[PDB]
Structures are given as C-alpha cells and as structure tokens.
Enzyme design. Structure first.
Site, short mmCIF file in Angstrom:
data_model
loop_
_atom_site.label_atom_id
_atom_site.label_comp_id
_atom_site.label_asym_id
_atom_site.label_seq_id
_atom_site.Cartn_x
_atom_site.Cartn_y
_atom_site.Cartn_z
N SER A 105 0.85 -1.19 0.00
CA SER A 105 0.00 0.00 0.00
C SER A 105 0.88 1.24 0.00
CB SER A 105 -0.98 -0.12 1.17
OG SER A 105 -1.91 0.95 1.15
N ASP A 159 -9.79 -4.35 -5.27
CA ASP A 159 -9.32 -3.36 -4.31
C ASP A 159 -10.10 -2.06 -4.49
OD1 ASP A 159 -7.86 -1.53 -2.73
OD2 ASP A 159 -5.94 -2.44 -3.27
N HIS A 191 -7.71 -4.89 -0.70
CA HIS A 191 -6.53 -4.18 -0.21
C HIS A 191 -5.93 -4.95 0.96
CE1 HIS A 191 -3.99 -0.70 -0.51
NE2 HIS A 191 -4.13 -0.42 0.78
#
Length: 210
Positions: A105, A159, A191
């Site tokens: 991320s 995601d 995610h």
C-alpha cells in the site's frame, strides 16, 4: 551470497507488526536473507483530517483513484530515509543487486519511488497494492542504473482502497520511464496481502537471484 530485503509497511502500521511476513518465505534459498522492517515517523495524514499516525508520506486523498492528488515533496522526504538504509547496507558490503525493496500500500508507493530514484541497480522492487506517488515530472530524475531494477507489481482486482486502475496506470508510466515491470493481478483480492501473493514474490526474488 548475502541478500537484503527491506519491507515497507502501509499507512498507520509499523515495522514490528509486519516482521511475521518473513515466516511465509519458507524457502531454503531465502532462509539466509537479512530482513529489515523500519517504522515510519508519526506524521499528520491529510486524508485522515490531519490525524497523526505512522505514515511514510502525506496522503491527500483516499480511496486512491487515477488522478487522485499526491504530495510529491513529502514522498521525496521518505525516499531519502529509505535511501539512507540502502546506502548503509551497501556501505557494509552488500551487493546492490542482492538488495530487494518490498512494500504494501503506502509502503508499496514508497518502494516504487525509492527504487526508481536510487543511483544504482538493485535486485528488485516488489509493489503490493501501491500507487504512483508522483507525476511524470520526476521521470527525468530517474538515474540510469535505477531503470534496470526489475519491478514486480501485485494488485487485487477488487481493491477499493487503492483502485486496481491506479495500479494499472503504473504500467504506461513505467514504460514511458523505460522501466521493466511485471504486473500480476489477483482476482477477488482487495486491499490486503494473500499468501499466494507472497509465494509469487518469493519465487520472483529467487529467480532474480538466479
């Protein structure tokens, strides 16, 4: 030889909380690798209304779409911190081609920025559900050797935190920069990190080590 793997955590997380990631890399070829899980400083985060948390760089907007705003100068500050870690481990005798940068991320976006700006070719950058944290204005500053570092981008198709299209947008950006990138989509993944995702990264690192 000596392998060094730098793992960069996501927003609000920490280094020690992600150190158990290395237990999923069970192969004999990576068993002697040296892992480092640094922790981001406590910074205000704009997409969380200025709330202070562990953050590599400021995130102006989340969920992240194609065209979502970014703070380029904040990213370059974090790059300097990552480069000091790589500089130190290279100044201790690690071959740069044995250095791998991985991140989830926000740490994935930092991995991309740190690798493309490092003056030397590294072993590889593994981006997990990241995004491109700067504009094409920065491409001219990518060092010559940095463009030879292989990038593995993993993204979940479902995601909704960092949209899959934002990961897709990294490929035309990287092609314009002259960077090789293998994009690996993960259907139904959001995610988060899946174990099959990590196993593919392990296999990818092993082949890069050859």
């Amino acid at each position: 030889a000596r392998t060094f793997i730098l793992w960069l955590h996501g927003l609000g997380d920490s280094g020690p909380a992600n150190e158990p990631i290395q237990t999923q890399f069970k192969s004999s070829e990576l068993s002697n690798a040296s892992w480092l899980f640094p922790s981001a400083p406590f910074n205000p985060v704009t997409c969380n209304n200025g709330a202070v948390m562990r953050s590599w760089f400021d995130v102006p907007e989340a969920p992240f779409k194609v065209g979502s705003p970014i703070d380029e100068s904040s990213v370059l500050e974090a790059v300097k911190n990552v480069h000091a870690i790589i500089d130190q481990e290279i100044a201790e005798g690690t071959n740069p081609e044995n250095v791998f940068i991985c991140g989830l991320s926000q740490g994935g976006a930092l991995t991309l920025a740190s690798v493309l700006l490092y003056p030397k070719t590294l072993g590889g950058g593994a981006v997990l559900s990241g995004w491109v944290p700067f504009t094409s204005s920065i491409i001219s500053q990518f060092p010559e050797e940095a463009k030879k570092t292989p990038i593995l981008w993993s993204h979940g198709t479902d995601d909704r935190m960092v949209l899959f299209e934002a990961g897709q947008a990294a490929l035309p950006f990287l092609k314009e920069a002259g960077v090789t990138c293998e994009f690996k989509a993960y259907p139904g993944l959001g995610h988060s990190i899946s174990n099959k995702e990590l196993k593919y990264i392990e296999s990818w690192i092993k082949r890069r080590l050859k």
